[PDB]
Amino acid sequence: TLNVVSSFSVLGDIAQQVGGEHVHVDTLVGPDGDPHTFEPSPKDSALLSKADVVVVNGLGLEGWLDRLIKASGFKGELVVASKGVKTHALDEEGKTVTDPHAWNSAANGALYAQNILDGLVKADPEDKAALTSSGKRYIDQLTSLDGWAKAQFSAIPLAKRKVLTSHDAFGYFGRAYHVTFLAPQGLSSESEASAAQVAALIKQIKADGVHTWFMENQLDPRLVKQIASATGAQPGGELYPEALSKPGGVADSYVKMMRHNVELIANSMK
Ligand SMILES: [Zn+2]
């Protein structure tokens, strides 16, 4: 059985579904964990030294990766799950900043799963037929999930499709399924929201009639609650943008994470 380490919980689940009985997957960032503020520990280094495959997001999400690979002595296979995926970027200070959250489009999740399948087959060719069978089944589930998600938003009004959340993690979801996401913090929870941005969000919501706000499982909800209180926005619940729920929760897998987020956002539209 291949020993696989994922950088964070979402990728660990995709690797588990693709690999099935032929992989054992551990994750560095766990359920409800913030991937932006994470730094790895000696326990993480020890775990990676035993691994056959490491699965990461790329797109700048794991700044610590190279130093952890060096310290651990990891000599296995590195799989960048975002390879080939079309990225989005923000235009800031005359430069571009890549948005790493590409998996919140289920069509991109299917591309992630194909990259992970490719890496597992490369690392375990003895099981290539079995891995390809379970992988292609999962990929088909994800492209059909993408079609289901589009359908939940396509037959409802295009006007006023705006929600408020804690940070800018749903950009690819919003582009794929056509919903505008507002948030006081940007692409990363390493950066505090400026007074300028908080004031502008409150003004925008008051002026443009945003009705629903969400918290996120990996990020302190105090700030989004402050904006909601200043605007009278009503709660829509808890979204799971970049970490699975704990076991027994509403977002125990990537599929269930996507379904949960789609259901909650669509229901708030409505
Ligand atoms: Zn994020």
Short mmCIF file of C-alpha atoms and ligand atoms in Angstrom, two decimals:
data_model
loop_
_atom_site.label_atom_id
_atom_site.label_comp_id
_atom_site.label_asym_id
_atom_site.label_seq_id
_atom_site.Cartn_x
_atom_site.Cartn_y
_atom_site.Cartn_z
CA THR A 1 0.00 0.00 0.00
CA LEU A 2 1.32 3.43 -1.02
CA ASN A 3 1.88 5.85 1.86
CA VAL A 4 0.55 9.22 0.69
CA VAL A 5 0.85 12.56 2.50
CA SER A 6 -1.35 15.46 1.41
CA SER A 7 -0.59 19.08 2.31
CA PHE A 8 -4.19 19.70 3.45
CA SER A 9 -7.35 17.74 4.07
CA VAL A 10 -9.17 18.40 0.78
CA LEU A 11 -6.34 16.91 -1.28
CA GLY A 12 -6.04 14.00 1.12
CA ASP A 13 -9.65 13.04 0.49
CA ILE A 14 -9.31 13.30 -3.30
CA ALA A 15 -6.22 11.06 -3.09
CA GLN A 16 -8.18 8.61 -0.91
CA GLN A 17 -11.10 8.42 -3.34
CA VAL A 18 -8.84 7.98 -6.38
CA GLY A 19 -6.54 5.44 -4.71
CA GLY A 20 -8.98 3.37 -2.64
CA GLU A 21 -7.59 0.23 -1.02
CA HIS A 22 -4.20 0.83 -2.67
CA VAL A 23 -3.29 3.99 -0.71
CA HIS A 24 -3.02 5.07 2.90
CA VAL A 25 -3.38 8.85 3.17
CA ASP A 26 -2.28 11.12 6.00
CA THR A 27 -2.69 14.90 5.89
CA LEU A 28 -0.51 17.69 7.28
CA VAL A 29 -3.15 20.41 7.71
CA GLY A 30 -6.17 18.69 9.23
CA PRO A 31 -9.93 19.24 9.30
CA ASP A 32 -10.98 22.83 10.08
CA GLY A 33 -7.30 23.84 9.75
CA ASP A 34 -6.23 27.11 8.11
CA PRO A 35 -3.78 26.32 5.28
CA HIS A 36 -2.51 29.92 5.01
CA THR A 37 -1.26 30.29 8.59
CA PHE A 38 0.00 26.69 8.87
CA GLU A 39 3.65 25.91 9.51
CA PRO A 40 4.87 22.30 9.76
CA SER A 41 6.25 20.63 12.88
CA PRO A 42 8.93 18.01 13.58
CA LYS A 43 6.08 15.49 13.68
CA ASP A 44 5.12 16.56 10.15
CA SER A 45 8.74 16.22 9.02
CA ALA A 46 8.92 12.75 10.57
CA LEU A 47 5.73 11.71 8.78
CA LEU A 48 6.98 12.99 5.41
CA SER A 49 10.25 11.08 5.76
CA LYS A 50 8.21 7.84 5.55
CA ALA A 51 6.06 8.85 2.59
CA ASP A 52 6.03 7.47 -0.94
CA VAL A 53 4.01 10.35 -2.45
CA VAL A 54 3.32 13.92 -1.36
CA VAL A 55 0.29 15.67 -2.88
CA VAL A 56 0.23 19.48 -2.79
CA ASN A 57 -1.85 22.30 -4.26
CA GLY A 58 0.85 24.48 -5.71
CA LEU A 59 -0.13 28.04 -6.66
CA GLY A 60 1.76 29.36 -3.63
CA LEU A 61 -0.36 27.61 -1.01
CA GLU A 62 2.55 25.72 0.63
CA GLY A 63 5.45 28.15 1.05
CA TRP A 64 7.02 25.75 3.58
CA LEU A 65 7.12 22.78 1.18
CA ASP A 66 10.71 22.98 -0.06
CA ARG A 67 12.15 23.41 3.42
CA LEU A 68 10.04 20.54 4.78
CA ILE A 69 11.13 18.26 1.93
CA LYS A 70 14.77 19.08 2.63
CA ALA A 71 14.50 18.66 6.41
CA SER A 72 12.51 15.42 6.17
CA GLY A 73 14.75 13.77 3.58
CA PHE A 74 11.65 12.90 1.53
CA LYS A 75 12.78 11.27 -1.71
CA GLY A 76 9.42 10.10 -3.06
CA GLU A 77 7.13 11.47 -5.74
CA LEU A 78 5.80 15.04 -5.68
CA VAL A 79 2.34 15.60 -7.20
CA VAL A 80 1.20 19.17 -7.84
CA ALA A 81 -2.56 18.76 -8.07
CA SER A 82 -3.13 22.11 -9.86
CA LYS A 83 -0.92 21.29 -12.87
CA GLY A 84 -2.57 22.48 -16.08
CA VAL A 85 -5.52 24.13 -14.33
CA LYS A 86 -6.48 27.58 -15.64
CA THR A 87 -5.73 30.06 -12.86
CA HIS A 88 -7.29 33.38 -11.86
CA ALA A 89 -5.28 36.30 -10.51
CA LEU A 90 -5.88 39.63 -8.79
CA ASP A 91 -4.33 42.81 -10.21
CA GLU A 92 -2.56 44.57 -7.33
CA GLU A 93 0.27 47.13 -7.22
CA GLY A 94 0.86 46.75 -10.95
CA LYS A 95 1.50 43.01 -10.44
CA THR A 96 -0.61 39.84 -10.47
CA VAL A 97 -1.34 37.63 -7.46
CA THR A 98 -2.52 34.10 -8.23
CA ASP A 99 -5.68 32.86 -6.50
CA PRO A 100 -4.78 29.38 -5.15
CA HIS A 101 -8.34 28.20 -4.32
CA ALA A 102 -8.89 26.45 -7.67
CA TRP A 103 -10.61 23.34 -6.22
CA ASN A 104 -13.85 25.18 -5.39
CA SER A 105 -14.84 24.63 -9.01
CA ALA A 106 -15.78 20.94 -9.29
CA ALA A 107 -14.57 20.96 -12.90
CA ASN A 108 -11.15 21.90 -11.51
CA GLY A 109 -11.51 19.24 -8.82
CA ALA A 110 -11.82 16.72 -11.66
CA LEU A 111 -8.57 18.04 -13.12
CA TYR A 112 -6.96 17.77 -9.67
CA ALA A 113 -8.13 14.17 -9.45
CA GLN A 114 -6.62 13.32 -12.84
CA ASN A 115 -3.27 14.76 -11.75
CA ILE A 116 -3.43 12.73 -8.54
CA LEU A 117 -4.41 9.59 -10.46
CA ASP A 118 -1.43 10.18 -12.78
CA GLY A 119 0.91 10.47 -9.81
CA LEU A 120 -0.45 7.39 -8.05
CA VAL A 121 -0.11 5.31 -11.23
CA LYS A 122 3.46 6.57 -11.65
CA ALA A 123 4.30 5.68 -8.05
CA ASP A 124 2.43 2.33 -8.06
CA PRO A 125 2.40 0.88 -11.60
CA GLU A 126 1.63 -2.61 -10.26
CA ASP A 127 -1.89 -1.37 -9.45
CA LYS A 128 -2.37 0.81 -12.54
CA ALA A 129 -5.51 -0.98 -13.76
CA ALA A 130 -7.24 -0.78 -10.36
CA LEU A 131 -6.15 2.82 -9.76
CA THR A 132 -7.31 3.86 -13.22
CA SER A 133 -10.71 2.23 -12.69
CA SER A 134 -11.40 3.88 -9.34
CA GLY A 135 -9.87 7.15 -10.53
CA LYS A 136 -11.94 7.40 -13.71
CA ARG A 137 -15.09 6.63 -11.71
CA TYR A 138 -14.31 9.46 -9.27
CA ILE A 139 -13.41 11.93 -12.03
CA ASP A 140 -16.76 11.20 -13.69
CA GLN A 141 -18.49 11.81 -10.36
CA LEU A 142 -16.76 15.21 -10.12
CA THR A 143 -17.62 16.36 -13.65
CA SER A 144 -21.24 15.37 -13.04
CA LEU A 145 -21.08 17.21 -9.70
CA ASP A 146 -19.98 20.29 -11.65
CA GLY A 147 -23.04 19.90 -13.87
CA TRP A 148 -25.34 19.52 -10.86
CA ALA A 149 -23.86 22.64 -9.24
CA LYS A 150 -24.31 24.73 -12.39
CA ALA A 151 -27.93 23.60 -12.54
CA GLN A 152 -28.67 24.76 -8.99
CA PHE A 153 -27.77 28.32 -9.98
CA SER A 154 -28.64 28.46 -13.71
CA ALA A 155 -32.46 28.35 -13.36
CA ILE A 156 -32.65 31.06 -10.66
CA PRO A 157 -32.40 34.86 -11.18
CA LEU A 158 -29.02 36.33 -12.13
CA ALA A 159 -29.71 39.58 -10.30
CA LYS A 160 -28.40 40.23 -6.76
CA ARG A 161 -26.49 36.88 -6.52
CA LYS A 162 -24.12 38.16 -3.85
CA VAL A 163 -23.11 36.77 -0.45
CA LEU A 164 -20.73 37.79 2.33
CA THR A 165 -18.08 35.44 3.76
CA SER A 166 -14.88 35.69 5.80
CA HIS A 167 -12.17 35.66 3.09
CA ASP A 168 -11.66 35.45 -0.68
CA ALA A 169 -11.70 31.67 -1.03
CA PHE A 170 -14.68 31.15 -3.37
CA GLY A 171 -13.43 33.02 -6.45
CA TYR A 172 -13.38 29.88 -8.62
CA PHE A 173 -16.78 28.77 -7.29
CA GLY A 174 -18.18 32.18 -8.17
CA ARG A 175 -16.76 32.09 -11.70
CA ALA A 176 -17.98 28.56 -12.39
CA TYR A 177 -21.49 28.90 -10.93
CA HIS A 178 -21.95 32.69 -11.30
CA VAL A 179 -22.18 34.09 -7.76
CA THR A 180 -20.45 37.19 -6.40
CA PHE A 181 -18.63 36.71 -3.09
CA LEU A 182 -17.80 39.65 -0.81
CA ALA A 183 -15.31 39.31 2.04
CA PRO A 184 -13.31 41.62 4.35
CA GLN A 185 -10.12 39.57 4.15
CA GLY A 186 -8.49 38.76 0.83
CA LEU A 187 -6.87 35.65 -0.62
CA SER A 188 -4.99 34.96 2.62
CA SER A 189 -5.79 34.91 6.33
CA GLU A 190 -2.20 35.97 6.94
CA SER A 191 -3.28 39.55 6.10
CA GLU A 192 -5.51 41.66 8.32
CA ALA A 193 -8.41 43.47 6.65
CA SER A 194 -7.69 47.19 6.45
CA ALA A 195 -10.05 49.78 7.89
CA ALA A 196 -10.55 50.94 4.30
CA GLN A 197 -11.80 47.53 3.17
CA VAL A 198 -14.13 47.00 6.12
CA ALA A 199 -15.71 50.44 5.65
CA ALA A 200 -16.17 49.85 1.92
CA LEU A 201 -17.80 46.45 2.44
CA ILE A 202 -20.29 47.88 4.93
CA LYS A 203 -21.10 50.69 2.50
CA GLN A 204 -21.47 48.27 -0.43
CA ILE A 205 -23.81 45.94 1.47
CA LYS A 206 -25.97 48.82 2.71
CA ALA A 207 -26.15 50.30 -0.80
CA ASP A 208 -26.55 47.09 -2.83
CA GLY A 209 -28.85 44.98 -0.68
CA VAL A 210 -26.74 41.96 0.25
CA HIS A 211 -28.87 39.83 2.56
CA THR A 212 -26.89 36.76 3.70
CA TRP A 213 -23.57 36.22 5.50
CA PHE A 214 -21.58 33.04 6.13
CA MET A 215 -18.83 31.96 8.49
CA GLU A 216 -16.03 29.58 7.48
CA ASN A 217 -14.84 26.54 9.40
CA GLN A 218 -11.13 27.44 9.33
CA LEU A 219 -11.27 31.18 10.14
CA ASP A 220 -12.28 33.30 13.15
CA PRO A 221 -15.82 34.58 12.41
CA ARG A 222 -15.53 37.70 14.58
CA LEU A 223 -14.89 40.10 11.69
CA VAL A 224 -17.62 38.81 9.38
CA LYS A 225 -20.00 38.94 12.36
CA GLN A 226 -19.01 42.60 12.89
CA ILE A 227 -19.84 43.44 9.28
CA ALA A 228 -23.12 41.50 9.49
CA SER A 229 -24.10 43.36 12.66
CA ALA A 230 -23.37 46.73 11.02
CA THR A 231 -25.56 45.87 7.99
CA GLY A 232 -28.36 43.72 9.40
CA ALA A 233 -27.38 40.80 7.17
CA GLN A 234 -28.98 37.49 8.04
CA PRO A 235 -26.97 34.32 8.75
CA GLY A 236 -26.80 31.66 6.07
CA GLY A 237 -24.68 29.23 8.08
CA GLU A 238 -21.16 27.82 7.80
CA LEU A 239 -19.22 27.28 4.57
CA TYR A 240 -16.23 24.97 4.12
CA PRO A 241 -13.89 26.65 1.59
CA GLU A 242 -10.51 25.06 2.15
CA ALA A 243 -10.66 22.34 4.85
CA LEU A 244 -12.90 19.34 5.43
CA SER A 245 -15.09 19.16 8.49
CA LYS A 246 -14.12 16.82 11.28
CA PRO A 247 -15.58 13.30 11.11
CA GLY A 248 -19.34 13.27 11.69
CA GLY A 249 -19.57 16.72 10.10
CA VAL A 250 -21.28 18.22 7.06
CA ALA A 251 -18.17 18.24 4.83
CA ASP A 252 -16.35 14.93 5.50
CA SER A 253 -15.19 14.57 1.86
CA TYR A 254 -14.48 16.84 -1.09
CA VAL A 255 -17.76 15.75 -2.69
CA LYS A 256 -19.70 16.48 0.51
CA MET A 257 -17.85 19.79 0.94
CA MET A 258 -18.91 20.88 -2.56
CA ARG A 259 -22.49 19.68 -2.07
CA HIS A 260 -22.75 21.46 1.28
CA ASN A 261 -21.43 24.78 -0.04
CA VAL A 262 -23.68 24.66 -3.13
CA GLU A 263 -26.78 23.81 -1.08
CA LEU A 264 -26.18 26.54 1.52
CA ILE A 265 -25.46 29.27 -1.01
CA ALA A 266 -28.29 28.33 -3.39
CA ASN A 267 -30.77 28.17 -0.50
CA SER A 268 -29.80 31.73 0.49
CA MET A 269 -30.51 33.02 -3.02
CA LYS A 270 -34.26 32.58 -2.37
ZN ZN B 1 -7.97 30.69 1.66
#
